[PDB]
Design a protein around this ligand. Structure first.
Ligand SMILES: C=C(C)[C@]12C[C@@H](C)[C@@]34O[C@](Cc5ccccc5)(O[C@@H]1[C@@H]3C=C(COC(=O)Cc1ccc(O)c(OC)c1)C[C@]1(O)C(=O)C(C)=C[C@@H]41)O2
Lengths: 601, 104, 131, 71
């Protein structure tokens, strides 16, 4: 009974042609799992091609083939056979039947004993590659990622071998982690993800009520909310963070109403993994651990904005204290640099005080690293280097001393971010330097030094060196340039023509730079620089909460310890919540919410 | 009306950041040149002449530290061009995103 | 809407009536087939339509776009590179670059099979550009 | 798109070779068998592969495929 005849029979779909197969299999002691019947290049079995070729609903050759497998005594059944390639490893026929959207074949395969925890862990099924599909590794994850709620409901609630929601793949991801990983912030994708997420949570409340599905961490240590915060998936992070359920599963909410009087109400938000009191929070991950381009859009969301504004309003005296200490330090730097040359003792005290302040700032910035932090690092490094060369009397200390003086007075613009009006202005300064200035300066220096070499070789004292002709040409861009008809020179008209062409080309280049900045500024969302400034302020408030480098600071927890309801296991659940008041003048059309308190307080 | 709105909004924060830039380079040039730059109050005037268009940059043969003075002047010219360009781009941001009936 | 519907109907009727002959292979007196005349003239809508074309089961051999496999949401599509690839003489790419006097040639470069084929050809030749 | 056309003209001139030494050029794509002709033969065509992701696939009808499983 040949292999190709077996594949042609199971692809055709007639069960009667599979006659005499079991009697042939009995005498030769060969099994359908054996390597003569697999492809060998991939390990593909005849049941897999029976499921790949289906009828209108379901092929009719599967169950007689599985009966023939049961008839002979096979220690390894055919329904649990996996692929063996490096590309497509661990894939089984239950995955194929779930992929083909076919519920009757899934019922049939589980009904004959298929493993519902087989992991499709080959290379095609891995995370970040070219032309792959990462859904998790499990059949329940494949059913949830492809919008098949009937297959999900069967795999959870079948009589024999139920699938576990707590089960997790090689990366430690459950089904909720995998639903975070497939989000792309499109409309249809988000509508799939939030609906399947809530359905899985409610089914876990029904099936396994004692376990918390969202507390389970991955192998990196992340829960679904922190993975959503790290990955930068805004649609599901916003949805999870303000979540309201109904009466039988109301303990799975993260948003509550404390009281409601007319149009005013007070809402409560759960601060479980959000508040920066605890280790490895959502705020620290948005600020410090996410490499997404849109972190500043995630700061602006609804519970986070008011929590950060409250944390900022407490820490304004510490911000003003740090500003005054840095400004006193720079006044001492200036008085020590201006008097370099009763007095010598004051100068010695000034030099030692500048060395201690430089070592202080350098240790603080290195403790940070273990745009603006780079500049504070460079100032501190050059200050310590200048004072170490001042101790040895190397006499080349004075350029480094005055260079670090200029950088310290410029680094004073870090503190402009305390106000909105100056903070957005300095955000724009950084964006003008790091984007628009450098390619201007590239094309300009290529234009400058070509004309410089041309004028030196043509004038051979107007232009003696390359380095002096480039200075005389730069004076044109300032406004101090000297163009005259040179009577002394042999080649007078050509020098005059080269100067006139230089002036025209640099006017064209400056005009292009200005027009490119208008192209960037007219085509822009106005909220974006505001939100970049908000993220600057959030990073500042988290570093001020962490404390200084020598003295760690004991930090208070935010919120209020408030009793929300009862757990399914007969206890009250007290949660730390953040209060946000609201006004709504269209309340009276909508239905009234359930409240914790009868009257305001 | 536009003259008042340009003075009371756009000019003062430009002038804040500009004076912080001006006097840092002034102190640096006086302490490095120790007669090109004798006092703080005269070096700040010589640096303000660059913003007008009358600034004098030359390779100072007399000074001990010649290349560093030249590099500090070139960096000053670049930073003030960046600041003026930012002021202009912020006024275009305020003027393109506005209702025309409001000044009326 | 007239041109693409009448074009497909004429192709299917040629499949029914004279199946051995290829209607789109016949050249003009300049040496251009319909796709190259569309590329030269700068007619974007019909050039885009011809370049990614899918028919149904009785005339499926007249397509220029195919599906190799499909698994859930991911799929791999196939595009015919008959007169497009610059390996052969007088291609669509050489005509858009060198023989068309249309003002909007740069809009025809951005279309869906052409953009990725040009990005692949650029990614191979970066060492020669740096050399 | 004007920059893209500049890049396309550059890549075609670099494929043509230098002026003294013409360059033997490779054909792009993959020689893949698509179906059968009306005159009882298979038609092999050179094709270019482009991958796609679509999260609204399940409302639409399924396409006809060349391969049963990915590769
Ligand atoms: C890291 C970069 C890109 C940088 C390092 C130094 C060399 C710098 O020259 C530049 C570019 C440059 C290159 C050559 C000639 C002139 C300018 O700009 C900054 C850099 C640009 C200036 C302007 O400073 C700012 O950007 C404003 C600012 C400072 C500190 C902040 O913490 C800050 O946060 C908002 C903003 C400061 C200098 O350190 C300075 O005062 C001196 C003497 C030169 C400046 O290079």
């Amino acid at each position: 009974f040949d292999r190709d005849r077996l594949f042609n029979v199971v692809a055709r779909g007639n069960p009667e042609d599979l006659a005499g197969l079991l009697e042939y299999l009995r005498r030769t002691s060969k099994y359908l799992t054996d390597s003569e019947y697999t492809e060998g290049s991939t390990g593909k079995t005849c049941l897999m091609k029976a499921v790949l070729n289906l009828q209108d609903g379901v092929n009719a050759c599967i169950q007689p083939l599985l009966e023939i497998d049961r008839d002979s005594g096979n220690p390894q059944p055919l329904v649990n056979a996996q692929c063996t390639d490096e590309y497509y490893r661990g894939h089984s026929a239950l995955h194929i039947a779930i992929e083909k959207r076919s519920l009757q074949c899934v019922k049939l395969l589980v009904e004959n004993g298929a493993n519902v925890h087989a992991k499709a862990c080959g290379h095609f099924f891995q995370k970040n590659q070219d032309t792959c599909f990462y859904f998790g590794e499990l059949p329940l994850s494949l059913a949830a990622c492809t919008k098949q709620w009937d297959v999900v409901n069967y795999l959870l609630e079948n009589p024999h071998q139920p699938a576990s929601l707590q089960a997790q793949d090689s990366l430690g991801n459950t089904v909720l982690h995998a639903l975070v990983m497939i989000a792309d912030d499109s409309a249809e994708n988000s509508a799939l993800v939030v609906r399947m997420y809530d359905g899985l949570l409610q089914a876990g409340a029904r099936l396994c009520p004692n376990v918390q599905l969202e507390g389970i961490p991955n192998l990196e240590g992340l829960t679904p909310l922190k993975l959503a915060a790290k990955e930068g998936k805004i649609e599901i992070f916003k949805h999870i963070l303000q979540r309201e359920f109904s009466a039988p599963c109301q303990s799975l909410s993260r948003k509550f109403t404390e009281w409601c009087y007319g149009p005013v109400r007070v809402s409560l938000y759960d601060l479980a993994s959000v508040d920066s009191w605890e280790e490895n929070s959502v705020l620290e991950i948005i600020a410090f651990h996410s490499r997404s381009p849109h972190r500043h859009r995630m700061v602006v969301l609804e519970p986070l904005n008011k929590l950060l504004q409250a944390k900022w309003d407490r820490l304004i005296p510490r911000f003003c204290f740090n500003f005054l200490c840095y400004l006193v330090y720079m006044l001492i730097f200036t008085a020590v640099a201006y008097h370099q040359p009763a007095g010598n003792s004051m100068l010695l005290l000034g030099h030692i005080l500048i060395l201690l302040g430089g070592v202080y700032l350098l240790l603080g910035q290195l403790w940070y690293f273990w745009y603006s932090e780079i500049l504070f690092l460079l100032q501190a490094l050059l200050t310590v280097l200048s004072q170490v060369l001042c101790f040895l009397a190397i006499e080349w200390y004075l350029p480094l001393l005055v260079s670090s003086l200029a950088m310290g007075w410029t680094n004073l613009l870090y503190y402009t971010r305390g106000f909105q009006h100056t903070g957005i202005y300095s955000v724009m300064i950084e964006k003008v330097i790091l984007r628009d200035l450098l390619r201007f300066l590239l094309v300009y220096l290529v234009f400058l030094f070509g004309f410089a070499v041309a004028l030196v070789s043509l004038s051979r004292p107007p232009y003696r060196s390359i380095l002096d002709a480039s200075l005389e040409l730069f004076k044109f861009t300032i406004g101090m340039g000297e163009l005259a008809f040179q009577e002394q020179l042999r080649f007078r008209g050509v020098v005059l023509l080269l100067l006139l062409a230089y002036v025209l080309l640099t006017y064209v280049l400056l005009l292009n730079m200005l027009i490119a900045l208008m192209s960037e500024t007219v085509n822009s969302v106005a909220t974006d620089s505001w939100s970049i400034w908000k993220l600057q302020k959030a990073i500042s408030v988290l570093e001020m909460e962490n404390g200084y480098w020598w003295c760690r600071r004991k930090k208070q927890r935010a919120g209020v310890m408030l009793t929300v309801g009862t757990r399914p296991d007969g206890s009250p659940d007290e949660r730390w919540c953040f209060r946000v008041g609201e006004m709504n003048w269209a309340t009276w059309e909508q239905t009234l919410p359930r409240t914790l308190c009868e009257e305001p307080s």
